């Protein structure tokens, strides 16, 4: 139909897939050339990324992520799969890497929690999630629901250069993200005090700083 | 008083020049301060990359390439020199490195052969003309004139060689080679079977693989 299932564009673009013959949120491409080009679509092409409601192969990857049906974006329902991805390479499916996913909260400009659990996850880890002020500089604020953030924000491990508490404190280079916060629990038990992990949000490579039982933030 | 002749800014930016008192394609800077910092300009300063319509001295580098007079960009008229480049360092001129250059088709929405000769050259070298990864093996196996490229080539999705991939995307869709194709000819006759020439496009270093009488591609 007119409205078809898609990922948040950057999920495919980080993967190398910038054009689509059918999906609206990407570059347009003629229906012929899609067979001779790496594209993102709902239909099967030899080199492509196939986005779909159902599963297609065993190597398909389910993503509990932000999504869009046609033009409008929608936030993720946390536990539930939003779409399966299937990376076709030379007319034969390939395994996708591991990655976390942005919830679609940035593009809807919503600063509210998805779950009750995530709300609990916020007050459990206040500094990282809710932010904190420390002598003319903002302390944490790693998430889109955090305070001291500006009215408007871009996308995917967003270095929102600016976090303010008016006439009091400010950090010039604060980094935030709209991923389901309790997805970070597995990385919050390092055997060392500090630990750095190479991760993917929306298939963009980025680091995750963690101090055990104190603070964390994703960082590009 | 003065015309505003200029290179495609990446040419100077790859050379490590970002400011200009006169030329509009760069970061502005006051003429007063032009003495005390490296600039790109049509005038001479103590430290400067001078651009001009004709040669200044023996060390001046003639460039047949895409250019711009003022704000507006022009495609290279192949055969003829577009501008001369003259690097000044502490008053004295310095020999610039050699380089290939981009023709300017990318930033004027063009997909055309500049010459009849270029159309011939692509016919003469079919393995740097059709395909993407089939005949050459860089990720961006694509001249800008290729049928196999998409009609649209926005900088945030495609990696113009000479420049970088724009925006936050991790992997580019491809890499567009927007450069007059017969200018590769000096590197097309190695004495060995394979050769990897260390070369420059717009003074940005890169490797050019050359399988003799077969194919070639920038990396």
Instruction: Tell the burial category of B90 from Cβ atoms under 10 Å away from its Cβ (0-12, 13-18, 19+).
Output: exposed
**Is B198 at the interface with chain A, CB within 8 A?**
no
Whether chain A has a CB inside 8 Å of the CB on B173: the answer is yes
Give yes or no for a contact between B148 and A36, defined as CB atoms under 8 angstroms apart.
Answer: yes
Q: Examine the domain organization and report whether A114 and A209 are in the same domain.
A: yes
**Is A33 near chain B, with CB under 8 Å?**
yes
**Is the four-CA dihedral A148, A153, A158, A161 of positive or negative sign?**
negative
B172/A19 Cβ within 8 A: no
Q: Is B5 left (phi over 0), alpha (psi -120 to 50) or beta?
A: beta
Chain B residues in contact with A203 (beta carbon < 8 A)? 170
Q: Are A73 and A4 within one domain?
A: yes
Q: Is the dihedral of CA B215, B197, B6, B83 positive or negative?
A: negative
Mutation target vs B (from A18, A97, A159; most B CBs, 10 A cutoff): A18
Three-state SS sequence of B183-202? HHHHHCCCCCCEEEEEEEEC
CB contact under 8 A, B132 and A36: yes
CA distance A15 to A156: 14
Determine the distance in angstroms separating the CA of A120 from the nearest CA of chain B, rounded to an integer: 32
Closest by alpha carbon to B23, among B83, B94, B107?
B83
Q: Which of A98, A121, A144 is the last residue of a domain?
A: A98
Nearest residue, CB atoms, A203 vs list B151, B157, B170: B170
Residues with Cβ within 8 Å of B42's Cβ and at least 6 positions away in sequence, in order, are B2, B3, B4, B5, B22, B23, B50, B51, B52
Q: Are residues A55 and A116 in the same domain?
A: no
**In A33-176, where do the E strands start and end?**
39-41, 48-52, 61-63, 67-69, 72-74, 83-88, 93-94, 158-160, 163-165, 169-171, 174-176
**Residue B52 sits in the same domain as residue B120:** no
Q: Does the beta-carbon distance from A13 to B152 stay under 8 Å?
A: no
Q: Any CB–CB contact under 8 A between B155 and chain A?
A: no
Cα distance between residue A165 and residue A132, in whole Å: 10
CB B27 within 8 A of CB B34: no
Q: Say which experimental method was used.
A: X-ray
User: Which residues on chain A are in Cβ contact (under 8 Å) with B156?
Assistant: 18
Compute CA B173 distance to the chain's CA centroid, rounded to the nearest angstrom: 20
Domain boundary among A55, A75, A98: A98
* Residues of chain A with C-beta less than 8 angstroms from the C-beta of B158: 18
**How far is the C-alpha of B203 from the C-alpha of B147, rounded, in Å?**
28
Q: What is the DSSP string of B109-155?
A: T----SSHHHHHHHHH-GGGTS-SSSSS-STT-EETT-TTS-S---T
Q: Can you give the C-alpha Rg of chain A in angstroms?
A: 19
Domain count, chain A: 2
For A193-202, letters b (16+ CB in 10 Å) and e give eebeeebbbb
How close, in Å, is residue A68 to chain B by CA atoms?
19
Does A93 lie in the same domain as A103?
Answer: no
Helix (H) or strand (E) holding B10: helix B9-14
CA dist A135 and B5 (Å) reads 52
Three-class DSSP category at B26: coil
Residue A6: domain span = 1-98
A113 and A62, same structural domain? no
What are the two backbone dihedrals, phi and then psi, of residue B122, each rounded to the nearest 5 degrees? -65, -40
Tell me the C-alpha distance between A145 and B188, whole Å: 58
Within a 10 A sphere around the Cβ of A35, how many other Cβ atoms? Answer: 14
Secondary structure (H, E, C), A53-80? CCCCCCCCEEECCCEEECCEEECCCCCC
Contact of B50 with B43, CB cutoff 8 Å: yes
B163 Cα distance to chain centroid = 9
Angle at Cα A156 formed by Cα A24 and Cα B18, nearest 5°?
95
Same domain, B9 and B28: yes
Contact B118, B124 (CB under 8 A): no
Cβ contacts of B216 within 8 Å, gap of 6 or more: B125, B127, B128, B136, B184, B187, B188, B208, B209, B210
What is the rounded CA–CA span in Å between residue A36 and residue A50? 15
The answer to whether residues A212 and A121 belong to one domain is yes
Resolution of the PDB structure in angstroms: 3.1
User: In this structure, are B27 and B119 located in the same domain?
Assistant: no
* B147, closest residue in chain A (CA to CA): A33
Burial of B148 per CB tally in 10 Å (0-12, 13-18, 19+): middle
B15 shares its domain with B42? yes
Smallest CA-to-CA distance from B179 within B195, B199, B196, B197 is with: B199
Domain end: B98, B131, B151, which one? B98
Q: Which of B20, B100, B113, B41 is nearest to B65 (CA)?
A: B100
Is the domain of A112 the same as that of A66? no
Look at phi and psi of residue A123 and say left if phi exceeds 0, alpha if psi is from -120 to 50, else beta: alpha
Question: Is the domain of A103 the same as that of A193?
Answer: yes
Contacts of B157 (CB under 8 A, 6+ apart): A13, A18, A19, A27, B169, B172, B173
What b/e string do you get for A3-34 counting C-beta neighbours within 10 Å, with b at 16 or more? ebbbbbbbbbbbbbbbbbbbbebbbebeeebb
């Amino acid at each position: 139909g007119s409205n078809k299932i898609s990922c948040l564009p950057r999920v495919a673009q980080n993967l190398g897939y910038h054009y689509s013959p059918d999906l609206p949120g990407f570059c347009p491409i003629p229906k012929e050339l899609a067979e001779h080009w790496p594209v993102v679509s709902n239909d099967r092409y030899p080199n492509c990324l196939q986005i779909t409601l159902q599963q297609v192969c065993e190597l398909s990857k389910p993503c509990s992520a932000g999504y869009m049906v046609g033009q409008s974006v929608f936030v993720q329902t946390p536990g539930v799969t939003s779409y399966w991805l299937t990376e076709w390479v030379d007319g034969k499916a390939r395994a996708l890497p591991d990655s976390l996913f942005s919830s679609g909260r940035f593009e809807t400009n919503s600063r509210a929690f998805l779950d009750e659990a995530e709300e609990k996850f916020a007050a459990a880890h206040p500094h990282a999630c809710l932010g904190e002020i420390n002598k003319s500089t903002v302390g944490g604020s790693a998430f889109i629901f955090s305070q001291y953030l500006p009215p408007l924000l871009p996308a995917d491990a967003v270095a929102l250069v600016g976090a303010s508490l008016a006439g009091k404190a400010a950090k010039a280079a604060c980094s935030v993200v709209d991923v389901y916060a309790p997805s970070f629990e597995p990385y919050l038990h390092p055997e060392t005090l500090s630990r750095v992990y190479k991760i993917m949000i929306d298939f963009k490579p980025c680091r995750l700083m963690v101090w055990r039982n104190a603070t964390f933030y994703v960082q590009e």
